[PDB]
Amino acid sequence: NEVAVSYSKSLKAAEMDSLQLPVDADGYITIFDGKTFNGWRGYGKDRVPSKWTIEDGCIKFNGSGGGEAQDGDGGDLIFAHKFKNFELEMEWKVSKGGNSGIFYLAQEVTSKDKDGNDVLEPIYISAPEYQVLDNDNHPDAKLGKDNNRQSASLYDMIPAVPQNAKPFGEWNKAKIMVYKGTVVHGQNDENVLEYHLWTKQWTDLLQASKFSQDKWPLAFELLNNCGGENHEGFIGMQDHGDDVWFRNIRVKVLD
Amino acid sequence: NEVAVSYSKSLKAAEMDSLQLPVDADGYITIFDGKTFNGWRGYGKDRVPSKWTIEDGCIKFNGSGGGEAQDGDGGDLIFAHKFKNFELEMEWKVSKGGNSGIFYLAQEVTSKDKDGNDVLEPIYISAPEYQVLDNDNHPDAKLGKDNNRQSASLYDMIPAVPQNAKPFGEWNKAKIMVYKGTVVHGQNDENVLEYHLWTKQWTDLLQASKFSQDKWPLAFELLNNCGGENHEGFIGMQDHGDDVWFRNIRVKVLD
Numbered sequence: 206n207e208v209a210v211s212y213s214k215s216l217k218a219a220e221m222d223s224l225q226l227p228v229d230a231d232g233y234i235t236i237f238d239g240k241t242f243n244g245w246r247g248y249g250k251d252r253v254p255s256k257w258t259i260e261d262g263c264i265k266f267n268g269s270g271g272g273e274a275q276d277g278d279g280g281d282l283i284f285a286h287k288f289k290n291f292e293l294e295m296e297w298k299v300s301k302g303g304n305s306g307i308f309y310l311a312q313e314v315t316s317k318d319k320d321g322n323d324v325l326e327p328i329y330i331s332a333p334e335y336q337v338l339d340n341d342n343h344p345d346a347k348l349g350k351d352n353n354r355q356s357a358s359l360y361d362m363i364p365a366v367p368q369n370a371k372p373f374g375e376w377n378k379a380k381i382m383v384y385k386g387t388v389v390h391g392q393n394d395e396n397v398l399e400y401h402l403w404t405k406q407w408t409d410l411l412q413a414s415k416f417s418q419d420k421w422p423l424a425f426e427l428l429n430n431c432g433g434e435n436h437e438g439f440i441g442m443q444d445h446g447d448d449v450w451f452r453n454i455r456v457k458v459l460d
Numbered sequence: 461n462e463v464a465v466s467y468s469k470s471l472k473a474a475e476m477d478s479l480q481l482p483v484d485a486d487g488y489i490t491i492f493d494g495k496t497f498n499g500w501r502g503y504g505k506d507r508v509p510s511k512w513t514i515e516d517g518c519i520k521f522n523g524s525g526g527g528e529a530q531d532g533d534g535g536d537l538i539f540a541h542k543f544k545n546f547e548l549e550m551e552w553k554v555s556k557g558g559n560s561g562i563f564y565l566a567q568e569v570t571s572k573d574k575d576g577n578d579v580l581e582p583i584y585i586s587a588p589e590y591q592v593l594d595n596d597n598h599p600d601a602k603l604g605k606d607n608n609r610q611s612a613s614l615y616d617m618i619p620a621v622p623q624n625a626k627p628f629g630e631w632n633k634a635k636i637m638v639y640k641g642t643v644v645h646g647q648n649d650e651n652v653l654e655y656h657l658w659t660k661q662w663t664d665l666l667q668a669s670k671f672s673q674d675k676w677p678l679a680f681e682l683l684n685n686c687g688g689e690n691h692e693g694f695i696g697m698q699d700h701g702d703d704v705w706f707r708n709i710r711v712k713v714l715d
């Protein structure tokens with residue numbers, strides 16, 4: 206009925222503690238219990254930012270409208286267990302004109318500035334993103350190429366086809382499967398895209414994106430070898446300054 | 461049909477009066493009516509400078525050729541309503557060898573001198589600028605870095621790519637969209653640059669510009685927190701001493 210799941214407590218720390226989490230007959234582990242943030246923490250932090258709350262059995266982000274600014278007590282949220290071959294399923298609801306995202310294979314990455322100080326880099330320069338978006342009112346829906354910044358897209362690389370999202374304020378179902386390099390995105394019980402990590406196709410997608418070797422050398426390096434040496438990393442959700450809700454979050458380990 | 465739009469009458473005043481302005485079916489408000497300067501005033505002033513006139517349904521600046529001097533009854537012009545999330549569309553036409561600009565998120569800023577007197581600061585140390593330029597004849601087109609002073613650039617920070625400006629004396633279409641910190645410049649119906657305010661990437665752009673913390677500490681402080689505490693400000697156009705025409709000036713409020 207339950208499985209032990211290790212988790213880390215702070216930036217780049219080892220997974221030295223474990224939670225007993227429910228698992229169903231098909232192997233899905235419920236990683237959000239509807240009541241606590243146990244195992245969850247802010248990306249780069251040792252605590253859950255206070256703009257993330259629990260309401261009506263959902264993880265809620267309380268956004269102030271600043272986009273990428275991540276002002277206030279915000280920042281992205283991760284479940285602090287590295288997964289490798291997994292299938293994640295969760296429900297998401299976005300506010301009108303809102304933007305968030307579901308990250309996977311994420312690494313906590315710092316760089317050094319010219320004086321040797323640390324700089325925490327964005328989660329999205331190591332983590333592929335399943336976009337979360339109000340496709341009718343957020344301008345990102347019209348940017349990019351072939352609708353590849355609309356909901357359930359692999360952000361700036363592969364559009365969701367079919368684009369079957371429900372409108373803002375409605376619950377959508379997300380699926381992200383990563384299995385030995387094969388990745389599938391699902392939206393509302395349909396597979397909307399499929400790709401293969403660490404291939405020539407993967408490099409070509411990156412080189413056509415905002416993360417190309419020319420535009421963002423660090424991002425290209427991280428994403429081209431997605432997941433680092435061990436090809437694993439965190440699932441998480443995006444602070445993009447907008448109200449968004451997530452619930453019924455469960456993960457099946459596939460090997 | 462029409463919508464009430466509040467405006468201020470003088471330096472740093474409250475927007476305690478309103479105009480009834482046309483709004484079309486897509487939500488764009490026409491803020492220049494082709495006939496009057498209602499709601500417009502000089503930056504830092506309680507009136508429209510007399511070098512700004514209305515000529516054949518256009519706002520025209522009548523330049524004497526002094527560049528930054530702002531001699532005579534000149535100075536920059538603002539529409540005195542603070543916008544936060546918005547899309548601006550307008551047409552611009554420059555004289556041969558001419559220079560102007562479209563400002564956004566502008567603040568009316570004063571500093572104090574050594575004796576405690578007020579000093580009105582330039583609009584462009586608070587306001588990002590969409591450069592307006594004759595790219596073939598004005599020397600700005602060869603200055604700066606990577607063409608970041610040509611038309612539709614974020615002046616001294618990000619070049620317009622592609623550089624699709626029409627020649628001098630021809631009408632160009634400008635788009636400025638600010639949506640929860642995401643900024644896009646459009647020129648002649650193409651998006652030519654995109655950036656995100658209040659991020660580490662924004663700070664780095666400023667720190668490489670004429671507005672860096674080392675070169676211009678007040679400008680750095682204002683622009684790094686662009687739009688002030690409430691992240692809003694005025695749209696306006698530049699007196700850079702050259703004849704320039706503006707028309708079809710429309711703004712959609714995006715939230």
Ligand SMILES: O=C1[C@@H](O)[C@@H](O)O[C@H](CO)[C@H]1O
Pocket residue numbers: 273304305306329334345360443445642
């Ligand atoms: O939604 C997004 C965009 O609006 C923009 O902020 O870039 C983000 C990171 O690639 C993406 O998550």
Ligand SMILES: O=C1[C@@H](O)[C@@H](O)O[C@H](CO)[C@H]1O
Pocket residue numbers: 528559560561584589600615698700
């Ligand atoms: O056009 C311009 C340049 O020629 C120079 O005067 O600086 C101005 C303010 O940054 C800019 O608008």
Ligand SMILES: [Ca+2]
Pocket residue numbers: 304305306334336337443445
């Ligand atoms: Ca997103």
Ligand SMILES: [Ca+2]
Pocket residue numbers: 559560561589591592698700
């Ligand atoms: Ca200018």
